[PDB]
Structures are given as structure tokens and as C-alpha cells.
């Protein structure tokens, strides 16, 4: 939810991403699932975020 | 549920303004926080916003700002203020940071400063009366609940000392006629010595429970001086209408507030208004004053007593003339009386209150109050004329009545005008003193005094 919200608010083609070193793997699992959610949320081409 | 976006696109630093480059949908007066590269935290207010570019005026100056290493966090809140009942008895900085070595206030509610104006239908005429303590104002130009009276003064006149005296000696007349009273004291651009004077006066006041003291120093940022009247009037509005308390607001040296408005207008790069001061000063001072009134719905009311310094020792200056046009009273501080060393330098002859009749009544104040006010005013004018006559003719040609007027003026200046800085007189006591002054005239001589009222009191 947090990623999706941040992507919606920031609303730019390419971004970076910083998170805690631990849980990065499940962050990776969240990643792309969110990107798809963002692309579906508004009629835009899915962003480059490959963070 | 919304989190701030910390921009780091500082592009261009000019004077007291810092400009951001790419800000996604800024608000106009969204308050904004700036972290220096060294880590110092300085606040600021967002000014005019263009398309994705926002210009920011910051407090505490612009020193230390770097284009690459300064980050700008956008709060997105338009300068809310915490206000609550317990705010009383504490001293606050220009922005509102508690300087009384006390805990930060726990907010009853967050309020927008520059609150929306009262529906004029809800306004009611001024009523009742309030004891300024100083007998001259209490009698000559009285002030009733709901009446906005400024106090014109000049640099070097003890305007601030008189304001502190009013703060100490303020109280409802209705107590004598038979705790809802409150004072929001906002001081704008006061000097360090006067700041210490106010702080000590509050420390040994003995009336802290009913007084809150907004304080904005000269060293404080100019925008803080601008916002100090706003937060002061907001707190007063809460404590008066939302809390049902009569409220007396004192604003000191609003010339500083006008100067700060001039500064911010120049910062906008807008053309200066007529006579140097900004054109919008009329609207600004109207918004500052018009918040004073009596609401029909709420028992509480607001009285506004700005202490406006008159530049060049005259009211011809744009700000004194403008505030006189807006407001409905003019009490004056005579330079000669201070030069003649009368601690209240009140200029009784220039002093006037438009709603004097409403303040004076039978239920509130005594019936003879207005009569003795008029009689003393006329007799004082006659005494000044007779003093001129004594000067020009050598005082031998004067009749007995002329000597009576002369001695009346002398006793008036000796006793009624001069008041102890800590001496407090109830309005009944002030009327008694004026009557004691009046006994020296014969009964027939008091032409202004109505019949059956003269014999009521002249008997003594």
C-alpha cells in the first residue's frame, strides 16, 4: 500500500527506492506487483519502476 | 494519512526569498520547513506559486542556504494554530513558541488565523463599560464593551508604560454596579528593554490568570511580526466567542506591523503603494480591527485598543489617518504633558470617543457621569482660554470667575490628570475625584450640569 501510494503521489516516469537492508527480498516481492497496481490505477504506461 | 514531500530543488536565492524549482502542486500559504545543509532547521512561508515553481520567504534570514545541499519539506498546512483555555497565563513568542519555560500548549482545537469575518447581521452595538483604571479615559472618553478605540502616540511618549498600566488595572465596571474578563496582549517589534519591562510586569502582576502576552521582539523575523496580530486575534476570538468571555486586546506600536507589511510587499516585488506605505494596508488594518465586536449569539465580546505610533508626531501620516478613518475613537498622548512630567500624558481635549453616550448609563456607571464629563471638558477649555488671557493681560484684569477657572485647571492637572503608575481608581472613585474638583465652582456656575443632579452631588 505504501509503495502504491508513493508512486501515485510522486507521479513521475522513473524513481529510486530506499528501504531497510533487511526485508529487501519481500520488498522485491512487493515490487512490480505494486508497479502493476500503479499502472492499473491511472491510465498511464507502467513506469520504469526497476528500482 | 498524507506525508510531506521533501523537495531538494532550491534554485536561486535572492534576498529574503528562496525559490524552489519543481514542486508538485504547492499550496499558496502552505507553511514550509527548511533543513540547512549544516542541519539547522528554519521555518518559512510559501509565497506566490507559479506553475510547478514556488517562491518561499523564510524566517531567521537566508544565510547558509546552498543550492545543492538544502532540502525543503512541504507540510501542506496553512499556518494552523493550537488554541485552548489553558493558554492564559503564559507568554508566547511571535510565532507562538512558549517562552515562559513551560510545556507546549495542549491544543483544544486547531484554528485558522485571519478568521472568516463576522456576518454583519450578527453584530450588535457596544454596551456596558470597562474600567481602564486611568480616570481620564474612564471619564472623558469612556470605552464600552465592543468599541475599537486606537491610542495615537509618538516616539518618546510612554505609550508602552500606559499599555502595561491598562493591562494591570483592567476590570469590569459591573462589579461596582452590583471573571469573564480577559486580555490578549500582543506586542509587535518592542525593544529589549521594553521586553524586560513587560516580562517583569507579568512576573509580579498578580493577575496572570486573566492575561496572555504575545511578544514579538525587534530581533524577531518581520513575518513573525506580521503574523503576531493574526494569532493574537485568533486566540482572542476563541477565548471570547467560543468561550463566552469579554476580551480586551491591546496592540502596541502597530507601526511596526505596517513596516513589516511594507517589507513583505516589497519582497513580492510589487510597486509601492501611495505615500510609500502599501495600498493594501487599509484592508489589512480593517481585518485586524474589524474582528472586534459584540456577537448577538454569544455573550462574550471583543474590545480593540491598538496603540498606534504616529510618525513625525502627527496624525497626518498615512497610517494614523487610515486607522482613524477605520476606527471610532481617538485618545491622544500630549508631548507637553510628558514634558511637564505628568505620568498620564493623555491629551484630554483631543481625546474623544464616538460611543461615549452608550457606555454611560444608570445601570452601568452613574447617571451623572456623562454630565460631569461634559462639564469638565468645557471647564478645561475655559481654563486654557483664561490661562491665555492671564498671560496676555497680566492677570490683574481677570475677574473672580477667571481666577476660579485658573485654579480649577491647576487642580485638575495636579490631581485628576496625574495618576500613580501603580495607583488604581475605580470609576466611582474617579467620579468622586472629579466631583471634588467640581465643588470649588459655585452651584450656579456649573451651567452644563443638569438640574436636580447638581444638588444631588454638589452638596457633598
Amino acid at each position: 500500500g505504501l509503495i502504491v501510494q508513493s508512486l501515485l503521489r510522486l507521479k513521475e516516469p522513473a524513481v529510486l527506492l530506499r528501504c531497510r537492508k533487511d526485508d529487501h527480498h519481500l520488498v522485491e516481492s512487493v515490487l512490480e506487483s505494486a508497479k502493476e497496481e500503479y499502472a492499473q490505477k491511472l491510465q498511464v504506461h507502467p513506469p520504469e519502476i526497476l528500482p | 494519512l498524507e506525508v510531506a514531500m521533501e523537495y531538494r530543488t532550491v534554485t536561486g536565492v535572492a534576498g529574503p526569498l528562496v525559490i524552489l524549482d519543481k514542486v508538485k502542486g504547492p499550496k499558496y500559504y502552505e507553511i514550509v520547513n527548511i533543513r540547512l545543509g549544516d542541519g539547522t532547521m528554519r521555518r518559512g512561508q510559501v509565497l506566490e506559486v507559479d506553475g510547478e515553481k514556488a517562491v518561499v520567504q523564510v524566517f531567521e534570514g537566508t544565510s547558509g542556504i546552498d543550492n545543492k545541499f538544502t532540502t525543503v519539506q512541504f507540510t501542506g498546512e496553512v499556518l494552523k494554530t493550537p488554541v485552548s483555555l489553558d493558554m492564559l497565563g503564559r507568554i508566547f513568542n511571535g510565532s507562538g513558541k512558549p517562552i515562559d519555560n513551560g510545556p507546549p500548549i495542549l491544543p483544544e482545537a486547531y484554528l485558522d488565523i485571519s478568521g472568516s469575518s463576522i456576518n454583519p447581521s450578527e453584530r450588535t452595538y457596544p454596551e456596558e463599560m470597562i474600567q481602564t483604571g486611568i480616570s481620564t479615559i474612564d471619564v472623558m472618553n469612556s470605552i464600552a464593551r465592543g468599541q475599537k478605540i486606537p491610542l495615537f502616540s509618538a516616539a518618546g511618549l510612554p505609550h508602552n508604560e500606559i499599555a502595561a498600566q491598562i493591562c494591570r488595572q483592567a476590570g469590569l465596571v459591573k462589579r461596582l454596579e452590583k471573571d469573564n474578563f480577559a486580555i490578549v496582549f500582543a506586542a509587535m517589534g518592542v525593544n529589549m528593554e521594553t521586553a524586560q519591562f513587560f516580562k517583569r510586569d507579568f512576573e509580579e502582576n498578580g493577575s496572570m490568570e486573566r492575561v496572555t502576552l504575545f511578544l514579538n521582539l525587534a530581533n524577531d523575523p518581520t513575518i513573525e511580526r506580521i503574523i503576531t496580530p493574526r494569532i493574537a486575534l485568533t486566540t482572542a476570538e476563541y477565548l471570547a466567542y467560543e468561550c463566552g468571555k469579554h476580551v480586551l486586546v491591546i496592540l502596541t506600536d502597530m507601526s511596526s506591523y505596517a513596516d513589516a507589511l511594507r517589507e513583505v510587499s516589497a519582497a513580492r516585488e510589487e510597486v509601492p503603494g501611495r505615500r510609500g506605505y502599501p495600498g493594501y494596508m487599509y484592508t489589512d488594518l480593517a481585518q485586524i480591527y474589524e474582528r472586534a465586536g459584540r456577537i448577538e449569539g454569544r455573550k462574550g465580546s471583543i474590545t480593540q485598543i491598538p496603540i498606534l505610533t504616529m510618525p513625525n508626531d502627527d496624525i497626518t501620516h498615512p497610517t494614523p489617518d487610515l486607522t482613524g478613518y477605520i476606527t471610532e475613537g481617538q485618545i491622544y498622548i500630549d508631548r507637553q504633558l510628558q514634558n511637564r512630567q505628568i505620568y498620564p500624558p493623555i491629551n484630554v481635549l483631543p481625546s474623544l470617543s464616538r460611543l461615549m453616550k452608550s457606555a454611560i448609563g444608570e445601570g452601568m456607571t452613574r447617571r451623572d457621569h456623562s454630565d460631569v464629563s461634559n462639564q469638565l471638558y468645557a471647564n478645561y477649555a475655559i481654563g486654557k482660554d483664561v490661562q491665555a488671557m492671564k498671560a496676555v493681560v497680566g492677570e490683574e484684569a481677570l475677574s473672580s470667575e477667571d481666577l476660579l477657572y485658573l485654579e480649577f485647571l491647576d487642580k485638575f492637572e495636579r490631581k485628576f490628570v496625574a495618576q500613580g503608575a501603580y495607583d488604581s481608581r475605580n470609576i466611582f472613585q474617579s467620579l468622586d475625584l472629579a466631583w471634588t474638583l467640581l465643588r470649588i465652582f459655585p452651584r450656579e456656575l456649573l451651567h452644563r450640569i443638569p438640574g436636580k443632579t447638581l444638588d444631588q452631588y454638589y452638596s457633598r
Binding site: 500500500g1 505504501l2 501510494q5 501515485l8 490505477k41 | 494519512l1
Partner: protein, 54 residues
């Protein structure tokens, strides 16, 4: 007479100090009792913490 009045005033000041201490103790007791509501206020915050969605 002034010395008698001053002794009375000192006694009154001491009694006022004691009454203020008692009132402060009562207020502290009320604040401590407020911890019961504070415990639920914490989870209320946590609820409004996670209301962030989408």
C-alpha cells in the same frame, strides 16, 4: 497590628500553598487515571496509522 496581620498573611500563604499542593495531587491523580483512556487511545492511533491505503 501590622505584625499580627503579617502573621495571619503568612499563615494564609502557607495554607494556600498546602491547598495548591493538594489540588496538584488531585490533578495528578486524574491524569494518571487518564492512562486508562490513553491505553485505548494508543490502539486508536495505530488504527488511524494504518488507514493509509492505495
Amino acid at each position: 497590628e501590622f505584625q499580627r496581620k503579617l502573621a495571619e498573611s503568612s499563615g494564609d500563604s502557607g495554607a494556600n500553598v498546602k491547598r495548591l499542593e493538594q489540588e496538584t495531587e488531585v490533578k495528578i491523580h486524574h491524569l494518571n487515571a487518564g492512562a486508562e483512556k490513553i491505553q485505548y487511545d494508543v490502539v486508536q492511533m495505530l488504527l488511524k496509522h494504518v488507514t493509509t491505503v492505495k
